[model samples]
Target: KTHVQLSLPVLQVRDVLVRGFGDSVEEVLSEARQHLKDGTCGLVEVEKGVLPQLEQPYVFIKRSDAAPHGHVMVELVAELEGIQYGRSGETLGVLVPHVGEIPVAYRKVLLRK
Candidate 1:
């Protein structure tokens, strides 16, 4: 066996569509339930046609879908769409280890509803 190590600057990712893999439907559902019961489920709200709040820390896991065979996972959804501010697919993204802020690339097509 071999090992691989790559160290990059720490980044605080914002407006990320968190998608999960390596699981099953039942398993993901159970995890969601447990998180809700544990009172660790952080929900967010935002102004219409705007992005979710960025000042808060959260791990958002919403819908689940079954993949080929029986693989199941979760993905994040954008609550708002179609605004003229940042780039087409721009968000206040990333926080480096200690330097400052991190710039995240945006693709307009991806932001389209």
Candidate 2:
């Protein structure tokens, strides 16, 4: 065997759509579980004032034909869409939309270098 070095970010992300933003870990996890069962993707929301700071030039939507598990990954693309401003408690967030299939489990997002 030969030794080699590579400079890159490798994220072993599992259940990409299974995330939620809430006050407590319990609440977040609860919401995540609900999303997993519902087969939905959590919205990627950022603070209203901080929206400009997030330079997401591209967006990738990951989808799997199997539910809760399985391989066959498929990613679809679309142009950047508008943001919807909303309030979650005292803070404000901008909700972005996903153009492809509703993200279930075993999905991943890969950013460009």
Candidate 3:
């Protein structure tokens, strides 16, 4: 039998701007979890509000196909002004379906094809 061992990235939660939701990050994460459950193609697009601290205008939450089940990926993309761009190389954190958030390392990368 073939084994499909999933290798999930280790992420931590830090410097996440939590607004528009409740006073705690729990509230924001809960909402994000729901969106993921009801997301389209395992993707959730969040624009406006919530993340005013970020220079990027858009944030995307997508289920990580490369990782184990229940692991989600958070991405910062596009700009507040100027021509649109790809992933901003800033990762928020990984959302665990029944758990909480995790931290992530920062890095810049080229646009994905």
Candidate 4:
């Protein structure tokens, strides 16, 4: 891997979105359980196999509830068209509606290189 020059004074990432990928459907469900329990799950390191063909950092995963008590691996439901956010599309989005819009991105503090 190429090392970052790090010669610049500072670096800024605008509108950075991080998506969390679990091993199985239960894995993501387990994550939602954590969110419901303590309201926290910081994805410091995301798995590579999670989402392929991702270019930038604008992509987002909005989770939906597939089971009772908000436990399930459901894809994002885009408010734009009232449809689901899927792969091989124009924009990358993971709808986590069950989690709601309660400052999710703020919850996870990723570890940078």
Candidate 5:
């Protein structure tokens, strides 16, 4: 028996569309959204990100031989009130397949070796 952590995530639907099961996206995205639209989404994955870190940004794979099964984790940290520091904002990082790396800005220090 073992415990595997799954990253809890919240997603926003920035685009909505009604299409056939076989409808080609190219045919659909070429126009101004005939029952479809193209847009973006936002997730508040912080600058420090989740614990034990990830192999790649937004990646949830476990370390080799580190754990018996795949695990995901999400941790939320809030600064102490009256403990003054930098001004307000959220920081995050993102990576999409074949699209390379993107720094979801707040701090650019998020790096992977």
Candidate 6:
């Protein structure tokens, strides 16, 4: 598997939905992952519009009501042989539950809706 150099993906990915299992969010993430492995879930990606298109294979996960089973879709795009772009966990200030009882230092980053 070719390693695609990573970057901070600037998009609307809620950290709550982004994390795996075992968090206060207590959402159905593992179920989503299983569906992903089973070929069902949501998909998202990033930028660059030049140089090398489809020299190889590229795979991405997608979710659509139109997609199969209304879960996730794994679609392949041609791997452009140039630059490419690319979890979360734990509690935070009032941003997180239970942990909120603990005191936060100055300038702590909090995830807010």
lDDT of 6 by residue, 1-113 (tens): 22111111222223223322222122333343343334232322233431122112222222211222221222222222342211122211111111112222222111110
Local accuracy by lDDT, each model = 0.27, 0.28, 0.31, 0.28, 0.23, 0.23
Candidate 6: stretches off by over 4 Å? 1-24, 46-113
Predicted candidate 3 versus true structure: per-residue lDDT over 1-113, tens digit per residue: 12222223223222333312222344444453344344211111233543344323333333222322432333323333443333333343323322333333322111121
Runs with alpha carbons beyond 4 Å of true place in candidate 4: 1-18, 41-113
Cα error, candidate 4, residue 28 (Å): 0.6
Question: CA shift at 95, candidate 6, in angstroms?
Answer: 22
Question: What 10-residue stretch in candidate 2 is worst by lDDT?
Answer: 1-10
Best prediction by lDDT: 3
Error of 5 at 23 (Å): 47
Please state every model's RMSD to the true fold in angstroms.
17.3, 15.9, 13.6, 15.9, 16.9, 17.1
Model 5 whole-model lDDT (C-alpha atoms)? 0.23
Q: Write one digit per residue (lDDT tens) for candidate 5, span 1-113.
A: 13323222222112112111122323322221221112121222424433223221122111222122333222221222223122322323221121112323321121111
Q: Ten consecutive residues with minimal summed lDDT in candidate 5?
A: 12-21
Per-residue CA lDDT of candidate 2, range 29-63, in tens?
34433433343433342334433443333222233
Name the better of 1 and 3 by TM-score: 3
Pairs with backbone N, CA or C atoms under 3 Å apart (clashes), candidate 6: 40-72, 41-71, 41-72
Residues 1-113, candidate 1, lDDT per residue (tens digit)? 12111122222244323322114434433443344344322232223532242322222333243232222233322221331211222222221112233423211111111
Question: Residue-pair clashes per candidate, as listed?
Answer: 1, 0, 5, 9, 1, 3
lDDT of candidate 4 over 60-91, digit per residue (tens): 33333223332223232222223223342222
Worst 10 residues of 6 by lDDT: 91-100
lDDT of 2: 0.28
Q: What is the TM-score of each predicted model, taking all chains together?
A: 0.23, 0.25, 0.25, 0.25, 0.18, 0.19
